[PDB]
Design a protein around this ligand. Sequence first.
Ligand SMILES: CS(=O)(=O)c1ccc(C(=O)C2C(=O)CCCC2=O)c(Cl)c1
Ligand SMILES: CS(=O)(=O)c1ccc(C(=O)C2C(=O)CCCC2=O)c(Cl)c1
Ligand SMILES: [Co+2]
Lengths: 371, 369
Amino acid sequence: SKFVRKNPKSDKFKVKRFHHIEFWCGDATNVARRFSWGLGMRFSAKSDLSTGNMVHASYLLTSGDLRFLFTAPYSPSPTTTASIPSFDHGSCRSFFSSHGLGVRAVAIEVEDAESAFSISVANGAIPSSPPIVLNEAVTIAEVKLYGDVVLRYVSYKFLPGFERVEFPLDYGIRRLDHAVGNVPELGPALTYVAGFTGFHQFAEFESGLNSAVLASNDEMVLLPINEPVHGRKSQIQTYLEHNEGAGLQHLALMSEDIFRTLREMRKRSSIGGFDFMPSPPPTYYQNLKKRVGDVLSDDQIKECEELGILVDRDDQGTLLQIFTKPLGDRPTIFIEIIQRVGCMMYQSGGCGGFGKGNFSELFKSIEEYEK
Amino acid sequence: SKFVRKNPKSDKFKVKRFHHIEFWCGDATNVARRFSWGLGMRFSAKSDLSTGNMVHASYLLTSGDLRFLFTAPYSPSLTTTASIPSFDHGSCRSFFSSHGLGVRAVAIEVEDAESAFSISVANGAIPSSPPIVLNEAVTIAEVKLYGDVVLRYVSYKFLPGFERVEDFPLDYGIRRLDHAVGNVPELGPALTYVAGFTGFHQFAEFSGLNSAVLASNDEMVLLPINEPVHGRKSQIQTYLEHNEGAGLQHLALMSEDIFRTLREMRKRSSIGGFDFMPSPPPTYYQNLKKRVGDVLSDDQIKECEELGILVDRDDQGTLLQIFTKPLGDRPTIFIEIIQRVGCMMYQSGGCGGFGKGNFSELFKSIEEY
Ligand SMILES: CS(=O)(=O)c1ccc(C(=O)C2C(=O)CCCC2=O)c(Cl)c1
Ligand SMILES: CS(=O)(=O)c1ccc(C(=O)C2C(=O)CCCC2=O)c(Cl)c1
Ligand SMILES: [Co+2]
């Protein structure tokens, strides 16, 4: 009858919000133009040959506060002209050859990235890139998160050496909600990240998985981590094979109206955008009526059925969510579109949870639908 | 007042059509999806995990008879399951790391690919992939064209291992591939190399570059080759530096109505499609009404101006063309859309040439104005 949650607000440095996601590409242009059309994100900044960067090509797409950065190495034929200082062709080519299209870097704003970096390394973080001040403006540092993903710190006083790009595109995507990594072993990954960050544990209510969510003090930076359960097979085990180890599994994208967004995105799956996981049976939506009846009107339940949208509830609020098919060649990274309703006071982070209860709700309605 | 062409029809094996182009990618899925929307090409066939292929991902777009194959290597941890028998992980990753996104293979239908291959290698051709017969249906061979591009021979009796994709659908008028142009450091050697093993003849010409066009007996397979002229800097040199050697410069796509195609493609430039080269000044389109006004109505002139379409003439016919910006990160491969008008007798290949004349016409319209 009552679910109680604790939060020791034990961040070791001041953390603000997600800043950007950096994908490592083979060709940044075609990936950036695919994502731009498929998600309704505007071309906003660039650092390439047209701006003087002869080391790497990097395009920034934005949608409200969401920033997707796409970076590809040029031919080596030194690094002075590069704008992102942690970059080198060897690590890029290795990453791509080993994992294919995927997230290299999850970037969080912090108060002081040099502060954030030294506290992290003192508490166990494996450094990947030390603090660099770019043009006495922004400071950027990087530490290993899991596998080949880096956590990147960004602090201020898009980036120096980027040029801005001038009715544009917008399907309602407003911000990144959470970024989820797949690891072989929850326990050590958790003690390692929680060890250097001080992020606390967020709460709960076959799956093939064990999950735990790491959260900053205000629970606005959310980092869930999944482990495969051995012994139908775990998609997470499947992820680890095709991704050649740990790596980022999915990004959830918060929308201000998931119906508009889903309408826009489903218009474009067959003309260059993203395809979606097959939708629940009709029994799943008959059961919505009185499981969230008090939050969704009957017209919005008809809307979820037309769009294949999943709904979940926890102690605080309600979550509307839908999962995209893998973004590239391998069955590795995919995207989630979500809208959280409730928990207003501003809206609190994790309002509605992460959809864990939809495993049963999907299985229940699939076995209901046969009979 | 008269231009005379010769054609020794000296092909050494029977050649039919441009069959497909194969791009080698980092990620086949995004490139193919981008090309699909920008060009109006249907997802036609595929060979990948969902088909059992654990070696490479390969997607086929088609528009009319034009076929674009996009191929990328999967992880080697997971080669009999591959459907393209010339594929190996190492070569692909070296290619992409050396050249970026680009064309790996120009494929032509030949009567018999093992015959075509054996005659080529005796007459100088460097082999890359020996004849392989697939499921007793199609034979496949590759010799070296220039740089890391191979000329690929296909003969029959899309490919075994490909599953068809069901699709309302996408179509902007692209109907076939017209020519495919390589950039090399030294025209002469490459010409004698390629012409030596094909028997292809020189199709004749009615700056920054020297070019010659090798054609098949019926001149339906057309392969121009560019050389940089040294000492404004040669865009062919710029190509050679950024692609790290010889490689394919552009593919010209024949459209059955370039006006239709361009309205479709320019609408999509800012929403994922392709952008175009800056268009000529207005004097270019004023000097058109007295240069091609016997072929295009005044309303078609106004249509070329609205779309930045270039027009040239030659002895037999008239060519409508326009060029795209570079397709990937590097300023290397780009696309051209063309429509040939004239030369009916079916239409003869190369009716109108290749746009040699527009260098002069673009300069002089710019000195005017
Ligand atoms: C197969 S499903 O029931 O529709 C479902 C639900 C939540 C999710 C995820 O967003 C959550 C969550 O985003 C964090 C990690 C634990 C999960 O499973 C996923 Cl990937 C799939
Ligand atoms: C600079 S332009 O007048 O727009 C022009 C014309 C022809 C072409 C080419 O299609 C032809 C032709 O495709 C190959 C032989 C040499 C050329 O220049 C190009 Cl890339 C540009
Ligand atoms: Co051309």
